[PDB]
Design a protein around this motif. Structure first.
Motif, PDB file in Angstrom:
ATOM      1  N   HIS A   1       0.795  -1.249   0.000  1.00 30.32           N
ATOM      2  CA  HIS A   1       0.000   0.000   0.000  1.00 30.32           C
ATOM      3  C   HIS A   1       0.830   1.304   0.000  1.00 30.32           C
ATOM      4  O   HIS A   1       0.292   2.407   0.143  1.00 30.32           O
ATOM      5  CB  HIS A   1      -1.056  -0.031   1.134  1.00 30.32           C
ATOM      6  CG  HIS A   1      -2.111  -1.072   0.925  1.00 30.32           C
ATOM      7  ND1 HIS A   1      -3.389  -0.761   0.516  1.00 30.32           N
ATOM      8  CD2 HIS A   1      -2.061  -2.421   1.010  1.00 30.32           C
ATOM      9  CE1 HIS A   1      -4.086  -1.873   0.378  1.00 30.32           C
ATOM     10  NE2 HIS A   1      -3.305  -2.897   0.677  1.00 30.32           N
ATOM     11  N   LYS A   2       2.146   1.182  -0.148  1.00 31.58           N
ATOM     12  CA  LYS A   2       3.011   2.335  -0.425  1.00 31.58           C
ATOM     13  C   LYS A   2       3.906   1.983  -1.566  1.00 31.58           C
ATOM     14  O   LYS A   2       5.132   2.074  -1.452  1.00 31.58           O
ATOM     15  CB  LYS A   2       3.882   2.706   0.779  1.00 31.58           C
ATOM     16  CG  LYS A   2       3.133   2.927   2.058  1.00 31.58           C
ATOM     17  CD  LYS A   2       2.390   4.223   2.025  1.00 31.58           C
ATOM     18  CE  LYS A   2       1.279   4.243   3.074  1.00 31.58           C
ATOM     19  NZ  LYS A   2       0.641   5.588   3.006  1.00 31.58           N
ATOM     20  N   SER A   3       3.296   1.534  -2.655  1.00 36.07           N
ATOM     21  CA  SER A   3       4.067   1.037  -3.777  1.00 36.07           C
ATOM     22  C   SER A   3       4.697   2.198  -4.528  1.00 36.07           C
ATOM     23  O   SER A   3       4.201   3.321  -4.476  1.00 36.07           O
ATOM     24  CB  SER A   3       3.230   0.156  -4.703  1.00 36.07           C
ATOM     25  OG  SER A   3       2.877  -1.051  -4.038  1.00 36.07           O
ATOM     26  N   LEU A   4       5.790   1.887  -5.217  1.00 34.99           N
ATOM     27  CA  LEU A   4       6.505   2.860  -6.059  1.00 34.99           C
ATOM     28  C   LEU A   4       6.548   2.280  -7.467  1.00 34.99           C
ATOM     29  O   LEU A   4       6.657   1.063  -7.623  1.00 34.99           O
ATOM     30  CB  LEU A   4       7.906   3.115  -5.504  1.00 34.99           C
ATOM     31  CG  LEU A   4       7.923   3.891  -4.181  1.00 34.99           C
ATOM     32  CD1 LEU A   4       9.389   4.034  -3.695  1.00 34.99           C
ATOM     33  CD2 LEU A   4       7.207   5.268  -4.260  1.00 34.99           C
ATOM     34  N   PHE A   5       6.448   3.160  -8.463  1.00 36.44           N
ATOM     35  CA  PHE A   5       6.268   2.790  -9.850  1.00 36.44           C
ATOM     36  C   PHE A   5       7.346   3.441 -10.694  1.00 36.44           C
ATOM     37  O   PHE A   5       7.713   4.593 -10.478  1.00 36.44           O
ATOM     38  CB  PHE A   5       4.877   3.253 -10.346  1.00 36.44           C
ATOM     39  CG  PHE A   5       3.717   2.541  -9.686  1.00 36.44           C
ATOM     40  CD1 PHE A   5       3.239   2.935  -8.433  1.00 36.44           C
ATOM     41  CD2 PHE A   5       3.087   1.471 -10.325  1.00 36.44           C
ATOM     42  CE1 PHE A   5       2.149   2.286  -7.834  1.00 36.44           C
ATOM     43  CE2 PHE A   5       2.005   0.809  -9.722  1.00 36.44           C
ATOM     44  CZ  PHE A   5       1.547   1.195  -8.489  1.00 36.44           C
ATOM     45  N   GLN A   6       7.780   2.695 -11.701  1.00 38.68           N
ATOM     46  CA  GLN A   6       8.757   3.106 -12.682  1.00 38.68           C
ATOM     47  C   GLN A   6       8.231   2.515 -13.970  1.00 38.68           C
ATOM     48  O   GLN A   6       7.606   1.441 -13.952  1.00 38.68           O
ATOM     49  CB  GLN A   6      10.125   2.512 -12.343  1.00 38.68           C
ATOM     50  CG  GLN A   6      11.291   3.173 -13.092  1.00 38.68           C
ATOM     51  CD  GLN A   6      11.701   2.462 -14.401  1.00 38.68           C
ATOM     52  OE1 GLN A   6      11.461   1.260 -14.595  1.00 38.68           O
ATOM     53  NE2 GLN A   6      12.358   3.211 -15.288  1.00 38.68           N
ATOM     54  N   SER A   7       8.475   3.188 -15.081  1.00 40.34           N
ATOM     55  CA  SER A   7       8.000   2.652 -16.357  1.00 40.34           C
ATOM     56  C   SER A   7       9.090   2.754 -17.423  1.00 40.34           C
ATOM     57  O   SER A   7       9.923   3.657 -17.399  1.00 40.34           O
ATOM     58  CB  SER A   7       6.725   3.380 -16.815  1.00 40.34           C
ATOM     59  OG  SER A   7       6.326   2.939 -18.096  1.00 40.34           O
TER      60      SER A   7
END
Length: 72
Positions: free
Chosen positions: A31-37
């Motif tokens: 529930h505190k995820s981090l995203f990169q694309s």
């Protein structure tokens, strides 16, 4: 960030390349995820900044990176 994905799509279409595709990477607490694309266009991989709070923000960052590099 509003408009990078659409600007990159227009670029793709103009230059007869497939629609950019996005890989989404998710890490950290559930529930505190981090995203990169990473956006992939004409075989070329362009990476977003890390640490976004959602996939769309990451994808927009990847598209921004792509656009900047395509101009150089």
């Amino acid at each position: 960030s509003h408009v990078f994905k659409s600007r990159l799509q227009e670029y793709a279409q103009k230059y007869k390349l497939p629609t950019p595709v996005y890989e989404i990477v998710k890490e950290g607490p559930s529930h505190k995820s981090l995203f990169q694309s990473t956006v992939i266009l004409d075989g070329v991989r362009y990476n977003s900044l890390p640490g976004f709070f959602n996939r769309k923000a990451a994808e927009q960052s990847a598209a921004e990176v792509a656009l900047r590099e395509l101009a150089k």
